Design a protein around this ligand. Structure first.
Ligand SMILES: [Cl-]
Ligand SMILES: [Cl-]
Ligand SMILES: [Cu+2]
Ligand SMILES: [Cu+2]
Ligand SMILES: [Cu+2]
Ligand SMILES: [Cu+2]
Ligand SMILES: [Cu+2]
Ligand SMILES: [Cu+2]
Ligand SMILES: [Cu+2]
Ligand SMILES: [Cu+2]
Ligand SMILES: [Cu+2]
Ligand SMILES: [Cu+2]
Ligand SMILES: [Cu+2]
Ligand SMILES: [Cu+2]
Ligand SMILES: [Cu+2]
Ligand SMILES: [Cu+2]
Ligand SMILES: [Cu+]
Length: 243
């Protein structure tokens, strides 16, 4: 699998570039296969790039695009900490995507109640359904990365990042609030044609260098975030400073 690193000046430049790249990737996938399956992420740059996509959203036939999430905060549906809510405000509420093409992870006041394990297994069955229909399962899985290398809600040195069988798990004790999350696991992330890590800032530079260096994914979860066709690091100068 090829690896691409593309370094831009600063956060604003990075987010603009990443949004442009995503519009191009979605168009390319629709051209080749008649549809596109994309996995969204949260965090500042993950949501910021979606705002840029919104600027060019007329270039895409959204009836042909399917949306998943790599992780989600297991909190009430209307909570500001929700990744799906933030994505809807940034992009999804502004485009002609059919609601049934959008596959949000469950909320804690949703159909599974506050049962985290059931909610994770619910999304896993949905991915099994996607994975029964397409190979690889995803065209592009977007990711942010924390300073310690975490991606989705897979934190270093945890049973979640160690998971090799299940596609989705619950995390009940995230070291970063909120404590409860639903997350795709590395086997699910790795069933993407491309995995894109969008990373800004000095505090991320050590983890970028360790992940690109080919670290063990348990120690640096981002090192296991690898696409079947390519892995793309979209970074700014500050985050690239140890390459
Ligand atoms: Cl609000
Ligand atoms: Cl339980
Ligand atoms: Cu640039
Ligand atoms: Cu600037
Ligand atoms: Cu472009
Ligand atoms: Cu409420
Ligand atoms: Cu809140
Ligand atoms: Cu809040
Ligand atoms: Cu708002
Ligand atoms: Cu709008
Ligand atoms: Cu359901
Ligand atoms: Cu349970
Ligand atoms: Cu995270
Ligand atoms: Cu254990
Ligand atoms: Cu350092
Ligand atoms: Cu410079
Ligand atoms: Cu869908």
């Amino acid at each position: 699998s090829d690896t691409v690193i593309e370094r831009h000046a600063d956060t604003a430049a990075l987010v603009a570039a990443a949004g442009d790249r995503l519009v191009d990737a979605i168009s390319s996938a629709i051209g080749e296969r008649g549809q596109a399956t994309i996995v969204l992420t949260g965090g500042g740059t993950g949501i910021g790039l979606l705002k840029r996509v919104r600027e060019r959203s007329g270039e895409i036939d959204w009836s042909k695009v399917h949306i998943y999430w790599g992780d989600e905060r297991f909190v009430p549906q209307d909570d500001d900490e929700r990744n799906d809510k933030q994505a809807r405000e940034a992009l999804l509420d502004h485009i002609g995507i059919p609601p049934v093409n959008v596959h949000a992870m469950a909320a804690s006041d949703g159909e599974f109640g506050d049962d985290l394990e059931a909610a994770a297994a619910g999304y896993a069955q949905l991915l099994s359904a996607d994975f029964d229909s397409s190979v690889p399962g995803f065209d592009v899985h977007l990711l942010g990365m924390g300073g310690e290398g975490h991606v989705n809600s897979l934190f270093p040195d945890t049973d979640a990042v160690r998971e090799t069988e299940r596609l989705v798990v619950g995390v009940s004790d995230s070291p970063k609030p909120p404590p409860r999350r639903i997350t795709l696991t590395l086997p699910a992330v790795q069933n993407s044609r491309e995995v894109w890590l969008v990373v800004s800032g000095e505090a991320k530079a050590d983890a970028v260098a360790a992940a690109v260096g080919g670290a063990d994914p348990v120690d640096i979860p981002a090192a296991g975030a690898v696409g079947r066709e390519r892995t793309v690091w979209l970074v700014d100068e500050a985050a690239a400073a140890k390459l």
